Amino acid sequence: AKQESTEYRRQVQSLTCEVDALKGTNESLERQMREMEENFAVEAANYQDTIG
Amino acid sequence: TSRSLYASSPGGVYATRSSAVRLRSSVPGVRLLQDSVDFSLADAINTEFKNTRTNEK
Amino acid sequence: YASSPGGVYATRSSAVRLRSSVPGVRLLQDSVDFSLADAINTEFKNTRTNEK
């Protein structure tokens, strides 16, 4: 368990930061989905402003 | 001077045999039933939604 | 003279379908609207009602 702890502290901190990087990725993927909400909206409405 | 595309099978197309690796998956077969197995009475009726237009015209 | 090719090649592909022993194919069965076909059925009633 003392030998294990020398990798386990890195495995814990890497799997923490890889979860935390997936968590900053998931908030930023919902920002890509907001910017897709604006893209489907400008596609629908601003195209019909050009028809207007 | 009209002539147009009188050719059948655009791009040479027909349903050529595919046959792959012999995958033995079980598939429990949750059917989409198809009430449009030639709903066809409806497409003879698409021709009669238009024979009704032919008689009125 | 209208030589114009009204037939476009509706491009099919079927590369050789490997061992799909990966079970992760979720079912979805989403259909059909097609409310434009009931608008066209209403335009056939309207076109007959104009022809009347």
């Binding site: - | - | 979805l28 989403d30 409310s35 608008a39 309207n46």
Partner: protein, 31 residues
């Protein structure tokens, strides 16, 4: 004529999106 008074209701029945209900009801009315 009685022209295309198409009431297009985009009834998107949101129990999510790819499941699946883009009901573009084209009520092509002949007013």
């Amino acid at each position: 004529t009685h022209s295309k008074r198409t009431l297009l209701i985009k009834t998107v029945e949101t129990r999510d999106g790819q499941v699946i209900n883009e009901t573009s009801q084209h009520h092509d009315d002949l007013e």
